[PDB]
Amino acid sequence: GLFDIIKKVASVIGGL
Amino acid sequence: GLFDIIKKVASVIGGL
């Protein structure tokens, strides 16, 4: 779902 | 870590 996409993007940003 | 970030970015692209 879109929300699973946003959650993954959030994790990526958290890992920068 | 890095590898998780790479997989998450890949998953997002794949899912868009």
Numbering used by the authors:
A (entry chain B), B (entry chain A): 1 to 16
According to the publication:
Citropin 1.3 is an antimicrobial peptide secreted by the amphibian Litoria citropa (Southern bell frog). In this study, the structural and functional properties of its non‐amidated form, which self‐assembles into distinct fibrillar architectures, are investigated. Using cryogenic electron microscopy, X‐ray crystallography, and fluorescence microscopy with model membranes and cells, diverse supramolecular structures, including canonical amyloid fibrils, multilayered nanotubes, and a novel mixed fibril type, are identified. Citropin 1.3 with free, charged termini, has a net positive charge of +1 at neutral pH, primarily consists of hydrophobic residues (9 out of 16 residues) and adopts an amphipathic α‐helical structure in its monomeric form.
Citropin 1.3 was found to form cubic microcrystals, which diffracted to a resolution of 1.6 Å. The crystal structure revealed two chains of the 16‐residue peptide within the asymmetric unit. These peptide chains adopt α‐helical conformations, tightly packed through hydrophobic interactions involving residues such as Ile5, Val9, Val12, and Leu16. Additionally, a hydrogen bond is formed between Lys8 on chain B and Ser11 on chain A. Each chain also exhibits an internal electrostatic interaction between Lys8 and Asp4. The α‐helical dimers further assemble into a spiraling supramolecular structure. Inter‐dimer interactions include tight packing between Phe3 and Lys7 of neighboring chain Bs, alongside interactions with Leu16 from chain A. Furthermore, Ala10 and Ile13 from chains A and B of adjacent dimers engage in hydrophobic packing, as do Leu2 and Ile5 from neighboring A chains. These tightly packed helices collectively form a supramolecular assembly resembling a nanotube. Nonetheless, the structure confirms that citropin 1.3 can adopt α‐helical conformations in addition to the β‐strand‐rich structures observed in cryo‐EM studies.
